[PDB]
RNA sequence: GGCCUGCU
RNA sequence: AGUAGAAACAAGGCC
């Protein structure tokens, strides 16, 4: 039958009908009479629509061939011959522009004169039944319907026929051409009734070929095919198989509970080796401040001018000389770098306006100090294979180092009060609710407690230094840059003040990965002689740069004044995390506020004021040789803030591992102290897990010592 | 006019012609998401790192013909170098602030009508009345509650057809909404937003947010009302209760 | 006196101050170089935990595979992957018996979803291993490349737009003699059957960074695109199953997890009378993923899908069949340094099979020597067990089956147990009349776990009396206690954009106040610090200050120009009006009534060249990877302002041979923008159909010109011009 | 010496 | 040298 559509109809219509065939997903080889019927429907749609044009009037202009002009409007514009999505697109667009009603089924054409749709259907059966059939299929329709049938008859409601009658003679001539051409073909044994509305399909997902063999190799050891295994599974029913293997399984497979008593836990062993060194990016306990007493705010001002003005406030400069060498570098380079920094600072002082940011010369001194041109050149393996020295990067456990007493004192003095306010908080919306007033009062109390704390000063120092370093690295990637360490505080009298700890020289910072390292050299003034705790300054070079006179009742001290100079490095991640050190304030004060709220849930009243003023209640916050010492809530605030600050400063994988594996043991010990009969399956394994995190970090070793002390004081 | 004209210009060049011809409508989404740009793992680190560069943000090419290349002192506002995989050009953040001090101005009177949820929140809070804070242990029990206080009793898909018919009346397809509540919602949000020119996509998104009901599991103590859950952070705490009555009531 | 914070625990219980034990204020550990060492170590460890299995050689991939299932029962407490098929089938049968109708229903909904799912659902995924280029690429890019290759090779069933048809094409590709791929350096290369099989069965290995809570780094894996559809269907089934199990806690959030934990502890302890003792085990499973054999997941799913259409069973079984034969790419490689000659070199991992061992240290030398026998075409066969939690939900199902197997109806003894399982972590409440009963119950639970290939970490687990325990960093002590140290890293600028960052910060403060019991004063301090960091990050200072920045001039002139300066946004150098009462309001709407109409109009102008919206999914959704958890998405309330710009892209593609991808990106985006202008609903609802672009665009041009004349700007001249231009593009597409 | 890139 | 820690950075590539 398909030979007929090969022969007669034009290409355009046959591929339109083929795409309509693909539309609903049925195959053309099984039933083709539908293809012919609907392609004839589509053909009558065209032949009825084309050759029919309109101009600004009604009364369509009919031309056998559209002449070249702007007057190519089509009388009837076709609906079908398009995908369902576009057919409904045209339906909705016509409804929204023509203000007509939206039909629920697919029309075939639209006309302007009568401003409505045409649903053309030419069926094998006579018209006077198919018409009202499709009419009762369509609900309350104003779209006019018109149908032909092979006998040659026409019909329509309203007795309406919308265009010329010679066109309809055309239609029925086409119709009988179709008819008495099948006459030569002979199809009416099924042509009248060949489609009955079949819609059914079964989804087929068959495993075959290579993928089947893979299925045959992904079974238990004693199975040969997926078919057999699935049959076995379907036939499988529970018949007490877990019990049999449990009985047969060796009894050494057990989870015996070892009781956890007061005498069970042993102190954590600390590693032994050379004392632990300093790792901070700046001096914390041995910092010195040169000040100007200016009225500018933290960010307000220009760095270089402030630094120069602060440094001019000090008199007593001496020619620098080596006091304590780096022990691994070239100290003369550090000396020359310091003198170069001074010289270029003067050079800025001379000229017209202090630059906002200064670049330094790339001398051999800072070329060595900043580690320039030291990365091995990257080459290909095929060119370097016979080199005996060629091997992997050194990948082994870090060097072992024992704890020293300097970190303990540094933390002790990091929780001490100061003679300045190191936090100038921002603005918030004016409090409107009583709860907001309570929150503001609490916040004011904590700010009064923590602002005068060395932890806040360290927070500001780190934030400013890391912000400046990151910005300089991102801006001046190539050229070495000078950045004075600046921090602005407020005195007890209320006068604002600036403080200059020293200088940082940032080097080449072409940082691609988050782990890539930018090297800088840090110089900081101090008065602490490095000849008393040399092991804490393994990586520092310390010079003697001047003498300071601070008013004291013992005449006047006239102390020496040294310069701690070192080469340090950071990374994008480290800079970003060090510039978010202000969340240590959060951590600490959230803990304290949780304490206050928990206690106030007992007594139905806010308990902040008496906690902060009466200072009756105290918490164990340290141990003295006499015994455990307790301090007021403010001291707890400062201690927790210092702990968070040191966590942010000495952060490392060792800290995370020890924190987790020691929190586990802390929970076990707490369960013991709560009389909850705690038990363990392998306590030695937990101890070994904790002890492997303690390698060389001073902070984690101090935490381990604190944990041992807590165990000793606990378990009683 | 224009649209078909850049269509013809695209089809003029062979590669885009092939892309238009062989690519089917269904694959639309795939090729639209086809990109070499990986999704950032650490957005904060790079936002703090990129903002230290010059020309850290991106803007459409049209910026080159509305904002001058430099400001009064000569600080550059935009660059003509296009982004990696787009025709947009990289520009400095000042071009933002500049646009807020001398850029073109319009009538933003209809934004309150579009962003109905947020302005309703503001109105509800502005007329609220606070009360005394009572300090006592709160037994916070976890419950499933509806957070959206303006949901019109419609699901995501249920209101999606409404949203299309309100914004994209022609792409609705087969669906013609039966429920009369949807009829009235369509009528109201059609006559209300008849000429709003913010964007079809944002209008649809905000209509989805407003009409679609959404639910989440939260620790609550008292309240349980939609209007009382948006301020759950302000009325309920660990050891304190703050009596509150939104402006709606 | 020496200060010691830990001594604070002598007065404050450990859980009431547990936040102090979370050093989440410093930089988390990161990996620096290759992850090849970790990948090799994981492969060797997975293979040696199942050493007593039986060896075979796959006839298709030619790789050695180790099957330990039904192997000898363990005789020691060391980890073992010798799961027994009959035991696990019986466990699943008991799970079904205790929950009748679970499998049949879940299979019904899964069948519905599978037969109505679309291909585009695969684009909604993070990095995936594209085999066309042998590298990780965004899910959409890899899917597009694979579809292009399939269409070039003759597999065009995916044009039906159905994920099931895409999987049919994927499987049909397995039986092809020779496929063709494209490489740029374009060159067409031919892949034989075995090479393509291994490329489709392989995984890409990387090192996990930003992982807090352990000293050593780990390795993670990413699969290809051929196997992700089957994984999606299997995980859909597993999620539908677990949603019907109250003992599971994987498909829920955190608060739901806490609620279920409280309910189970109350149920276990309350029902226990005075005579019965109760004990809670806070258990962690050692080597959870390395001991889960994909064959056992195949067994579980084929038991689940019994009495179901065979096509459903086949499509759900394809995934574990491929995992059982999965291969793993070793990794980036190894970098060597020579200090004598002062140079460095980078050898790819694919050379580990043949490269001499003189360059490697003792540990790496032994690892390579042990893993070499499993090396096939630069990748190692990893049949014995899963690599990194790809089947999280099925593992949770197995754990829930173990938990339910002690409902006192199967124990047949006075003791019994229950609890909650979330993959790699569990809490087990066991009750028994005497300590001997508790010991016997825990021993039998451990033994049954060892029969299913699941091991309990004795070093990271402990048992106490009920009332105090831990679960996924949630510490329960007669009621869950807030931590607030897990969410600390999320208190900074997110890094999306100005408005997005502001809204996300305020919303995070609000949420942590609601959930994590953040205090009022602490919340105010957090708001202040966040505002400070936000202003210092975006160079948007108050405007009344003299802080010179790259943006302080325009901000200052805008400040001096504005009359009501209280309405200026913090992004434009205005005061901050936020407070505890205003944390749930966007900044634009909070300052709407205070803004000057000129500034208000300039700010919220639709014609701004900065705002760009792509799809309904990416309107106000921000992907923030939370600390100590999987990547998560958040809805943030924000108004589309001129500050909603999107930041610059990487731009490093210009120096790589893969430079043509940018031109393809630009052309695809131009075509997509044209289509959207032709089809406005393209973004909100993704278009569907089987026609091509130009057909729809030209036909809609026809119709829209027509109707927009029937009322609108068009004119006959223009309408006819459009009609004949449509004809012109038609004949152009003809040729 | 000149120019390109900074998660590809 | 320095940062850092089971492998890396201490710029890369292209002419």
Numbering used by the authors:
A (entry chain A): 1 to 716
B (entry chain C): 1 to 249
C (entry chain B): 1 to 185, 207 to 756
Q: How did the manuscript describe this experimental structure?
A:
Further 3D classification of this map yielded four maps into which models were built, resulting in four distinct polymerase structures. The class 2a and class 2b structures, representing ~78% of the particles, are similar to the class 1 structure; however, the flexible C-terminal domains of PB2 remain entirely unresolved. In the class 2a structure, as in the class 1 structure, the priming loop is fully ordered despite no template RNA being resolved in the active site. To aid in map interpretation the programme deepEMhancer was used for low abundance conformations. Both the 5′ and 3′ vRNA promoters, but no capped RNA primer, was observed in all structures. The 5′ promoter was fully ordered forming the hook structure bound by PB1 and PA as observed previously. Only eight bases at the 5′ end of the 3′ promoter were observed, four of which form a duplex with the 5′ promoter while the remaining four are oriented towards the polymerase active site.
